[PDB]
Ligand binder design. Structure first.
Ligand SMILES: *[C@H]1O[C@H](CO[C@]2(C(=O)O)C[C@H](O)[C@@H](NC(C)=O)[C@H]([C@H](O)[C@H](O)CO)O2)[C@H](O)[C@H](O)[C@H]1NC(C)=O
Ligand SMILES: *[C@H]1O[C@H](CO[C@]2(C(=O)O)C[C@H](O)[C@@H](NC(C)=O)[C@H]([C@H](O)[C@H](O)CO)O2)[C@H](O)[C@H](O)[C@H]1NC(C)=O
Lengths: 211, 215
């Protein structure tokens, strides 16, 4: 099968800037290439085909190039509505195959996470569960690491993480990290800590409580 | 004029099969082969196959071996995809599209979820601080929305009247059911002196949970 490798899963740009997204085919497809935009929830919309032909209705800001194996979608004068997913498709050979996609994101000033840790509620505990929840809100850039410790020692089992996409209003990211234990396990320990490392600080941000 | 309109979301058990159909309109059905594509969160698109209505030519991707059967009923201008022996890895959004290069001629998509889980309403647990050591002009509260199925749920705080300073996170799977969390950050002068409630709606179970956060 023909493999389509898209350079980067995430790129950062600013409104008004130019950005280019590459796509490499594992073998020559001439110019049998299409570039698609796709917003969350929605169906794909063509931008380019034959590697360089713009579809009618598409802003002039979008161009495409390349022939053979290497292809580039370029977005000049980036607008905020452009901050979404883009993938390539080859149509020289079956099976039809596609890049894995590139998400465009907005550059903004660095911002440290605002961290909050919550003990389990008594209602949860009475039902035999103990979820300790840590929110790490409104930070930038997206890259962050969260570690849990119980009584000073690292805990990995029982952690689930969830991350938002870039916020439409302030361009930050947020994350939630939840450590779930039994009531009995929770009750054997004193100290519960959520630690976050982010480029805004050389020391981890530490939030904690003691039972 | 050109429209490809797909059937509604499906939820099915492992082992079952399903039929997802695609009603073409605004062109002559036989002029163009209908292609099928699978989109799974984070991962790429996979082309499944096509059916050529005025031709009878059917091509499949070997990837989906004995998993897929494509049909068409020229009478209603409808192409269909029958999937069998489903597993949770088949959960995805499935699209029909017009021709091998579809341009804007895609269907809206059909969500397939494959799971042995039963429809289950959320249990909602309050997240409140205990006493702190210092005085904070701000306070964060939350809701842990645990153990529901299927997606989605929506969360608001004080019926939406409170929306700046809310973060609601994508659900995760935890014991074959979904869990999500939501936080809200408000001035400490407004809570607990004023009531703060997380409002959780789970349409599949026709359930609403209004959990007041008390100190
Ligand atoms: C092969 O593609 C044909 C349709 O051919 C055209 C058409 O005229 O409809 C050729 C035309 O050049 C294409 N447009 C562009 C910009 O290249 C056009 C569009 O791709 C199409 O209209 C979008 O739906 O396609 C048939 O669909 C035929 O069935 C198909 N063969 C297979 C196996 O899919
Ligand atoms: C126009 O035709 C294409 C596919 O064309 C072929 C094919 O399958 O490649 C040509 C091929 O030579 C034929 N196969 C053999 C062995 O002779 C084949 C047969 O006609 C077909 O398999 C019979 O079942 O057709 C697409 O099918 C395309 O959809 C079609 N255009 C339209 C509008 O239907």
């Amino acid at each position: 099968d023909i493999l389509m490798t898209q350079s980067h899963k995430f790129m950062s740009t600013s409104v008004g800037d130019r950005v280019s997204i590459t796509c490499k085919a594992s073998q020559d497809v001439g110019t049998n290439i299409a570039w698609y935009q796709q917003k969350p929830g929605r169906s794909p919309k063509v931008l380019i085909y034959s590697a360089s032909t713009r579809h009618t209705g598409v802003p002039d800001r979008f161009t495409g190039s390349g022939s053979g194996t290497d292809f580039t979608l370029t977005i000049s004068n980036v607008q905020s509505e452009d901050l979404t997913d883009y993938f390539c498709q080859q149509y020289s050979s079956f099976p039809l195959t596609f890049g894995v996609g590139t998400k465009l994101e907005l550059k903004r000033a660095d911002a440290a996470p605002t961290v909050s840790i919550f003990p389990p509620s008594s209602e949860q505990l009475t039902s035999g569960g103990a979820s300790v929840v840590c929110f790490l809100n409104n930070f930038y850039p997206k890259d962050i690491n969260v570690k849990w410790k119980i009584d000073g020692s690292e805990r990995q089992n029982g952690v689930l993480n969830s991350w938002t996409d870039q916020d439409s209003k302030d361009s930050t990211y947020s994350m939630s990290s939840t450590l779930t234990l039994t009531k009995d396990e929770y009750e054997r320990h004193n100290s519960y800590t959520c630690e976050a490392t982010h480029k805004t600080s050389t020391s981890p941000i530490v939030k904690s409580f003691n039972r | 004029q050109v429209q490809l309109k797909q059937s509604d979301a499906e939820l099915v058990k492992p082992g079952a099969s399903v039929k997802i159909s695609c009603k073409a309109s605004g062109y002559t059905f036989t002029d163009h082969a209908i292609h099928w594509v699978k989109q799974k969160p984070e991962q790429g698109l996979d082309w499944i196959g096509y059916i050529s209505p005025g031709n009878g030519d059917i091509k499949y991707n070997e990837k989906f071996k004995d998993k897929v059967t494509l049909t068409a009923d020229k009478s209603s201008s409808t192409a269909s995809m029958h999937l069998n022996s489903l597993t949770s890895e088949d959960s995805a959004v499935y699209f029909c599209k017009r021709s091998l290069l579809a341009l804007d001629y895609w269907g809206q998509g059909t969500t397939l979820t494959v799971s042995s889980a039963k429809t289950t309403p959320p249990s909602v647990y309050p997240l409140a601080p205990g006493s702190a050591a210092q005085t904070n002009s701000m306070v964060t509260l939350g809701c842990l929305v645990k153990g529901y199925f299927p997606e989605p749920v929506t969360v608001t705080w004080n019926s939406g009247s409170l929306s700046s300073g809310v973060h609601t996170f994508p659900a995760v799977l935890q014991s074959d059911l979904y869990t999500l969390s939501s936080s809200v950050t408000v001035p400490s002068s407004t809570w607990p002196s004023e009531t703060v409630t997380c409002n959780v709606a789970h349409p599949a179970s026709s359930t609403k949970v209004d959990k007041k956060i008390v100190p």
